[PDB]
Amino acid sequence: ADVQQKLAELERQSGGRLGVALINTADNSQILYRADERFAMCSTSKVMAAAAVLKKSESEPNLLNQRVEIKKSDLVNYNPIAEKHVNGTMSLAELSAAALQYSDNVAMNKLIAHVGGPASVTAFARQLGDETFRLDRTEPTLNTAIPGDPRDTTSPRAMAQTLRNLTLGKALGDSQRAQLVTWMKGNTTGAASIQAGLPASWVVGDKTGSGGYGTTNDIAVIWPKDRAPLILVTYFTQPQPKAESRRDVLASAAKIVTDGL
Ligand SMILES: *[B@@]1([O])OC2=C(C([O])=O)[C]=[C][C]=C2[C][C]1[N]C(=O)[C]1[C][C][C][C][C]1
């Protein structure tokens, strides 16, 4: 109850809406705050798309080495890796890493397309028992994050449970799980978010997200020092369409829910 009040006060000062889901796998205890409300996933959805490709590769062993053409007309708003490979190709492995570790939007679009479109990424979540996740649009419009819009949303509880199944559970084959975890542990975008609220000695694999209405997200699997692993989802969105990102809010939330662990 103390943590709930701290998160409520953090939220008040932030001026936005905060969603938190922490799963402690030591005993399956949880800290939940607006955990059943819907939030625009933004780029945190790229974990689901990469996972669906990994699942597909479980029956197509050389799948991750297949080449995908990168076209100039594919470039959108944020293409840090794909812009370097225009007029060439990238493997699905490289596209998965680019989406997860640099939040490349072209890579996400290639991941979505390869599994049949957003409805197939959603079908994958259903296959995992996730009835809340829904992916409706491609990059970049899936990040609009309009209040009241259910497109491209999920709840902190649903994503925390699915991330547990993906990174610590049996959603993926163990070889594919290891690749997903390795990729997420190599993320370059998360130093100011969840990671920033945890001790430096803790190992973090995370995927961040940014969108309209100042939406600022992060989902992580965490191996604390001398503790069982944790799953943490911190979603944050704001009332103003042009609101600025608040990664500091996610760091504060992580510090609050891990205080005293
Ligand atoms: B995605 O949300 O991830 C992302 C991030 C991040 O990881 O927080 C940072 C910068 C760009 C991206 C690409 C994805 N978000 C968007 O494309 C979004 C950026 C702000 C305006 C609306 C589109």
Q: Is 155 in the pocket of ligand 1 (CB under 6 A)?
A: no
- Judge if the upstream peptide bond of residue 80 is cis by omega within 30 degrees of 0: no
**Nearest one of 136, 109, 119 to 50, comparing CA atoms:** 109
* Domain positions in the chain: 1-261
Q: What's the rounded Cα separation, in Å, for the pair 42 and 186?
A: 19
**Last residue before each gap in the chain (C to N over 2.5 A):** none
Q: How many CB atoms lie within 10 A of CB 170?
A: 10
- Rounded to 5 degrees, what are φ and ψ at 209? -150, 145
Give the residue carrying structure tokens 């100011």. 192
| Cα 123 to middle of ligand 1, angstroms | 24
For residues 60 and 68, is the Cβ–Cβ distance under 8 A? no
Tell me the HSE value of 138 on the side-chain side, using a 13 A CA sphere.
Answer: 16
Element (H, E) at 158: helix 156-167
Q: How far is CA 98 from CA 3, 192, 206, in A?
A: 35, 19, 14
From CA 64, how far away is CA 175, in angstroms rounded? 13
In angstroms and rounded to an integer, the radius of gyration of the C-alpha atoms of the chain is: 17
Identify the residue whose C-alpha is closest to ligand 1 atom 18: 211
Residue nearest atom 10 in ligand 1 by C-alpha distance = 210
| 173 close to ligand 1 (CB < 6 Angstrom) | no
DSSP run (H or E) holding 20:
strand 17-24
Residue of 43, 79, 139, 206 to mutate, ligand 1, most atoms within 8 A of C-beta: 43
SS3 31: strand
Name the region of 148 (left: φ>0; alpha: ψ -120 to 50; beta: rest): left
Correct CATH for 1-261 of 2.60.40.10, 2.40.30.170, 3.30.465.10, 3.40.710.10: 3.40.710.10
From residue 107, give the alpha-carbon distance in Å to each of 76, 77, 130.
11, 12, 24
Which of 46, 78, 249 for a ligand 1 pocket mutation test, highest count of atoms within 8 Å of Cβ? 78
Distance separating alpha carbons of residues 120 and 122, to the nearest angstrom: 5
Torsion over CA of 242, 153, 69 and 174, rounded to 10 degrees? 130
Q: Could you tell me if 76 and 139 are in contact, meaning their C-beta atoms sit under 8 angstroms apart?
A: yes
Q: 59 Cβ partners below 8 Å, 6+ apart?
A: none
* Cα–Cα dist 224/202, whole Å: 5
For ligand 1, the distance from its centroid to the CA atom of residue 161, given in whole angstroms, is: 23
Q: What is the Å distance from ligand 1's center to 75 Cα? A: 14
First to last CA, the chain: 15
Query: CB count, 10 Å around CB of 175?
Result: 10
* Listed resolution, Å: 2.0
3-state SS assignment for residue 169: coil
Phi, psi of 9 (to 5 degrees): -75, -40
Q: Which residues are catalytic?
A: 43
User: HSE-up of 103 (CA within 13 Å, CB side)?
Assistant: 20
Q: What gap in Å lies between CA 213 and CA 155, rounded to an integer?
A: 17
Whole-angstrom distance, CA of residue 66 vs CA of residue 144? 31
Instruction: Report CA-CA distances (Å) from 25 to 13, 30, 89, 153.
Output: 30, 9, 40, 25
Q: How many Å apart are CA 113 and CA 138, to the nearest integer?
A: 9
Method: X-ray
Distance 95 CA to ligand 1 centre (A): 16
What is the number of the ligand 1 atom nearest to the C-alpha of 247?
A: 8
Residue 215 and residue 237 in contact, taking contact as beta carbons nearer than 8 Å: yes
